[PDB]
Design a protein around this ligand. Structure first.
Ligand SMILES: *[C@@H]1O[C@H](CO)[C@@H](O[C@@H]2O[C@H](CO)[C@@H](O)[C@H](O)[C@H]2NC(C)=O)[C@H](O)[C@H]1NC(C)=O
Ligand SMILES: *[C@@H]1O[C@H](CO)[C@@H](O)[C@H](O)[C@H]1NC(C)=O
Ligand SMILES: *[C@@H]1O[C@H](CO)[C@@H](O)[C@H](O)[C@H]1NC(C)=O
Ligand SMILES: *[C@@H]1O[C@H](CO)[C@@H](O)[C@H](O)[C@H]1NC(C)=O
Ligand SMILES: *[C@@H]1O[C@H](CO)[C@@H](O)[C@H](O)[C@H]1NC(C)=O
Ligand SMILES: *[C@@H]1O[C@H](CO)[C@@H](O)[C@H](O)[C@H]1NC(C)=O
Ligand SMILES: *[C@@H]1O[C@H](CO)[C@@H](O)[C@H](O)[C@H]1NC(C)=O
Ligand SMILES: [Ca+2]
Ligand SMILES: [Ca+2]
Lengths: 533, 177, 533, 177
């Protein structure tokens, strides 16, 4: 029987076996409460510490997830990972059990003739678009086991409940962000009791998640010592959809939709502070394409200034940073109009850009089109597609990523950058597609080592399981020492602005320099200079 | 003098702690305190510098017989000083510095605590700190006297030096007591 | 004794031996007059047929060259070939003997157990900037011999004498062009008497010369049948310095300098029609950088419209076309400011462009700079130079070249395109330099096969002589059949707009596709679209 | 009828000369002449076309009983026609066409020579000519009668056809005489 005493009470976790004969067992503590339920008067309020119990709390099954609605395709296809979209079914059978009281986290502890002493802790911040998800999807047992580290998937307030701001004092948003910090405080204090080492906490996440990871490092609320490392996979604080800059506009539109658009903010907040949680979560506030309606907001306190500025001013502490992108992040962007012959009509391309420009920049247009046309084949529709997809991929993921890595290094932080070129080949993702947004998640969670799962159906090859191990060993080594190479043919050299060495993670890992240097520069360099006249 | 004491003779000296590369810390807040004794009008006691490039720095000096501090984390140079009391009287004195972004604090012996709350918008982080230099020689204002119990954000640099720390390097006319 | 009867009289040519034991002998007929001396009242007048003689005319030594002045460095360094500039000495000892009566051409005939029947004829139109030169420099004996073709280097009115126009009827310029046609008429009628085949005349030239070649194919004065093929090496009718668009401006400035700027054109022409030929040729009319003062002009008759338009409207007959460029054409452009460490200061680069833009286009600036900076090494001064040189090379040579090839093909003309990547390594041209403007000439003239010469000093390696043969065999085969592959590892496939196959002529000849497709497009595609708003 | 004569019966026919790729000529001037005999009101006798893409083309037809020609080398369509004399009287007639850029010329039997000198600015070259089509069938106006001595810029297409030229292809209700 698995018992552990915490500063709030004792709890019992259920032990589990893994679908592999090399992976030891794992003790799972599902449903642990790390804060006071954000209910009633506590809604739209900074999270509170949790209340203690005397007895022994049954922590053996996922606690309810936060209020969301994914079914009716109102979810921004492009922003969410592919595995999440190409399987809304299985996903639904996770977030089907909701509740306004959802602030809970899951702990995965390994069990031992290899390493003695406190084990590192990897906190995974899940994320889609801030509107849905649950760290309950990501089962970090193979990771926890295979790496010999404790893994914690966290749950935090999403949607309206988590990030609604009025622009003024009525509601300063960033609630879900504060929730994430509260989880980290809880961790830094109690993970010790589970054999964890509060001096080696690495927070990591994918997409919207990695955006939190990054925003967390920009908020003064994360004080020195809270967590030591960060891994931001396919995600930044610099993307167009990482922050909401019109928190009021969309707050009032949500107000109007549930009858509350009063002229005074404070009344408007109280108005909403009443409505059934499910009434607010089912509205339909639509944000400009490639932008978010509800999410982190520049409040001046939690998020002191615009991420992009803070980054340039070095307004962040020093952590060990690891971040990267996947080859074809923006699959969904083009997958939308790829004819039966796997091509793209030059008129659809000319259009897609003109449109992309209208939304992200309201002449550059002709410059973009030029830059993204392989003239040594200016007519191949299959090529015309590859480049059209790179356009999104470069701009929405690669450019911001490099931007981040460049500054994080120029300011002392030890940085490692990676490019992911390998995905699992199923029938749900076209053959001509490549590593799409999120295709790295199943390799970071060691799924291949336990064969296909209801969530990740793909029929993993021997390579997938092999590469899965190569990845996990990096991630964990990193979590262990702050170097993907210690302790456990290719040395993942460090990323510096002068050489920009990145590890090309694929079936042939190998260090290359200046990832997509050209386009990366078009976006961080030329485009600005132009829109500057 | 509290515990480990170092004596700086004529010709000055310099004890330098060099943080190991992948460990140069960044900080929003700072706690610096040291106990001295000197009969100088001008001299720099302690100085922390951010690895070449980044500008940020922290300096504890004695200007015209009054102990004070000057630092910069990104905006302008902010200084705070105990101009009333005097401390270059060859006797024992203890000064405590405090920083929280731009806002700072100073306090000598038991005099009232001084508070500096810089102007307009202020930057907050002291990026990649790489070296603590005691002796104020390199900055061109050698110190001559005695320093004890130097505490910087948890580092008791002076003991570290005494216990032959792999990173502390003593050079000059400095001697242990 | 070498005698030949022509429709104007008999002439004696001196026979010659070649510095190689594989090259047969050659009968040279130097100084042949192909037109009436452009003197007195004939100056600024279409050339006239030559007057006949009864006896036997001694055609054994170069006749005087046309009026020019190259010594005092007033010559546009960049426009002229490198071998010409890096050796003004030897060059001077050619054009030292001047005369207003210079319309003469040289014939090089081979002497025979290989081919029976009339031999093909290759007419080389020399050219620098239209202001100097002489086909007397180019000795086509090794070519004539090694290929079994007759070679004719021609002389035509240059400078003021050859292209001065008043913008109106007073003087319609293009005199030197008409001279070149008169040479072709003479050839088409009499080259038969030398064993030549008037049905296989290929006119070729380098730089300013190849510009004439091209302009010749655009003028209606070249009627069907005159000549059948054309080779334009490093030169077009499309370059900024191929035509003079302000013939009046520079005519009056020449007038003013010799006291003649009267208000009436006709008087101004007569005024100049008097001055000693050497007084006009020694003035100093300066044209805008990258442009010409005196040269071919759009007169509406000889040159019907703007070359660029004629080209797009297919206003040219069909010929077998062969044209190309060299790797580092614009050496002189950057050689100007390459510091001791073979680099280029970013400020000198930022400058060179801003300047280049001011002259060729009076914002694109920032776009050019971007396009010509290898961001995967945005600081290497040696690289910063390579690209800065490509800028000129691409714009002044490569772009116009491709432009021509694209249209010539789209209109039926069988086209072949080549890129020249190999030069002779001497001490006059820096080591970091590559095939500069004109470095192909010595290989097309078979110089390597006769060892270094006073003109071409370089110490030719065994490769140079080898590659020299490879080149000559193409050029001649072309002149022979209109296919560089017939009759004599690499097949020089044909150039079509859809695949743009070009022969990468170097030590490893091999066919590649879409030469510098990227930049070529920036210049013929993007830059225009922009300067179009 | 002068020499080689071809007879086009009902159902029409078509003799087509296809210039070998690398030999499709371009021309500034054109000399076209042919001798016919027909009792039709509408019909196209000869038509030269520039390889697909390039627009240029030349057409010799009979519109409302009068022989005429329509061509285009790049600007507009230029036409010239002998509208006075009549030629669909089943008897022998010879027409001669001439082009020099836009300016053109026509002449039937012995009637005065007709001269058309097109408007504003005119283009000059008939680019990449690829096919000569006799029978005016493909153009949708079949010819029925007899054609002899067809001369186009040096090509005596009709003999060429008779002498089984590797490039001439006869198809339809055409017969030799
Ligand atoms: C010094 O402490 C902080 C900076 O570290 C200052 O922070 C806020 O500054 C605004 C602007 O003047 C004040 O109005 C707030 O009251 C401060 N609140 C916080 C977060 O401390 C602070 O002002 C400075 N000290 C004070 C409160 O006087
Ligand atoms: C939950 O608590 C109950 C208290 O009666 C305990 O009996 C049980 O073992 C715990 N969990 C389960 C269902 O095993
Ligand atoms: C909501 O109410 C405010 C104040 O009454 C008003 O300014 C705003 O436009 C309203 N929202 C809309 C446009 O429905
Ligand atoms: C194996 O993968 C394929 C999908 O491409 C499919 O057969 C199925 O999903 C998996 N299992 C099997 C063999 O049925
Ligand atoms: C030139 O012609 C003369 C005729 O008087 C002849 O004697 C001589 O040999 C010829 N060649 C020369 C110039 O030697
Ligand atoms: C030549 O004379 C004309 C007539 O007045 C004058 O306008 C022109 O400027 C003169 N040329 C120059 C620029 O010397
Ligand atoms: C050979 O060329 C080089 C100059 O590049 C130099 O050795 C000399 O000028 C030439 N002949 C020799 C070996 O002297
Ligand atoms: Ca470390
Ligand atoms: Ca700073």
């Amino acid at each position: 029987d698995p018992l552990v005493t915490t500063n709030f009470g004792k709890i019992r976790g259920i032990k589990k076996e893994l679908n592999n004969e090399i992976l030891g067992p794992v003790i799972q503590f599902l449903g642990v409460p790390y804060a006071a339920p954000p209910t009633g008067e506590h809604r739209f309020q900074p999270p509170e510490p949790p209340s203690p119990w005397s007895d022994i709390r049954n922590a053996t099954q996922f606690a309810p997830v936060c209020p969301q609605n994914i079914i009716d395709g109102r979810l921004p296809e492009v922003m969410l990972p592919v595995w999440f979209t190409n399987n809304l079914d299985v996903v639904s059978s996770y977030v089907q059990d909701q509740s306004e009281d959802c602030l809970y986290l899951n702990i995965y502890v390994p069990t031992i003739r290899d390493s003695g002493g406190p084990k590192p802790v990897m906190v995974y911040i899940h994320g889609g678009s801030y509107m849905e998800g649950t760290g309950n999807l990501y089962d970090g047992s193979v990771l926890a086991s295979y790496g010999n580290v404790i893994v914690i998937t966290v749950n935090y307030r999403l949607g309206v409940l988590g990030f609604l701001s009025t622009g003024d004092q009525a509601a300063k948003g960033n609630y879900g962000l504060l929730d994430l910090i509260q989880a980290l405080r809880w961790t830094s204090e109690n993970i010790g009791f589970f054999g964890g080492d509060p001096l080696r906490i690495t927070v990591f996440g994918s997409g919207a998640g990695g955006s939190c990871v990054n925003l967390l490092t920009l908020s003064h609320y994360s004080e020195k010592g809270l967590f030591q490392r960060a891994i931001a996979q396919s995600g930044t604080a610099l993307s167009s959809w990482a922050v909401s800059f019109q928190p009021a506009k969309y707050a009032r539109i949500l107000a109007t939709k549930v009858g509350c658009n009063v002229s005074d903010t404070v009344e408007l907040v109280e108005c909403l502070q009443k409505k059934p949680y499910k009434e607010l979560v089912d509205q339909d506030v639509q944000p400009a394409r490639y932008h978010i309606a509800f999410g982190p907001v520049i409040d001046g306190d939690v998020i002191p200034d615009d991420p992009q500025i803070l980054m340039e001013q070095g307004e962040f502490l020093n952590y060990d940073i690891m971040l990267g992108v996947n080859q074809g992040e923006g699959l969904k962007f083009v997958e939308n109009i790829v004819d039966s012959d796997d091509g793209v009509s030059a008129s659809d391309f000319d259009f897609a850009v003109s449109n992309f420009v209208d939304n992200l920049y309201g002449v550059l247009r002709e410059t973009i089109k030029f830059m993204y046309t392989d003239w040594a084949d200016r007519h191949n529709p299959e090529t015309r597609r590859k480049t059209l997809l790179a356009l999104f991929t470069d701009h929405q993921w690669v450019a911001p990523a490099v931007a981040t890595a460049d500054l994080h290094s120029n300011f002392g932080s030890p940085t490692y950058f990676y490019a992911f070129y390998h995905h699992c080949q199923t029938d749900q993702v076209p053959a001509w597609a490549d590593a799409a947004h999120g295709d790295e998640v199943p390799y970071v969670l060691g799924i291949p080592m336990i064969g296909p799962t209801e969530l990740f159906p793909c029929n993993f090859s021997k390579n997938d399981v092999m590469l899965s191990a190569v990845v996990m060993t990096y991630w964990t080594n990193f979590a262990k020492t702050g170097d993907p190479n210690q302790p456990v043919e290719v040395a993942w050299t460090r990323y510096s602005q002068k050489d920009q060495l990145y590890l090309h993670i694929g079936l042939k890992p190998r260090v290359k320099e200046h990832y997509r240097a050209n386009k990366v520069n078009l976006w961080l360099e030329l485009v600005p200079h132009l829109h500057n006249l | 003098h509290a515990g480990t004491t170092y004596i700086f003779s004529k010709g000055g000296g310099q004890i330098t702690y060099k943080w190991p590369p992948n460990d140069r810390p960044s900080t929003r807040a700072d706690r610096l305190a040291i106990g001295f004794s000197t009969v100088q009008k001008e001299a720099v006691l302690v100085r922390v510098d951010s690895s070449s490039g980044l500008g940020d720095y922290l300096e504890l000096h004695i200007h015209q017989g009054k102990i004070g501090v000057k630092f910069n984390v990104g905006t302008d140079d902010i200084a705070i000083e105990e101009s009333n009391a005097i401390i270059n009287d060859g006797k024992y004195h203890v000064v405590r510095f405090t920083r929280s972004g731009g806002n700072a604090t100073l306090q000598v012996d038991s005099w009232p605590v001084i508070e500096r709350y810089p102007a307009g918008r202020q930057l907050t982080i002291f990026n990649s700190q790489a070296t603590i230099i005691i002796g104020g020689k390199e900055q061109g204002q050698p110190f001559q006297g005695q320093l004890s119990g130097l505490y910087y954000n948890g580092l008791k640099v002076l003991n570290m030096a005494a216990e032959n720390d792999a990173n502390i390097a003593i050079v000059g006319n400095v001697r242990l007591v």
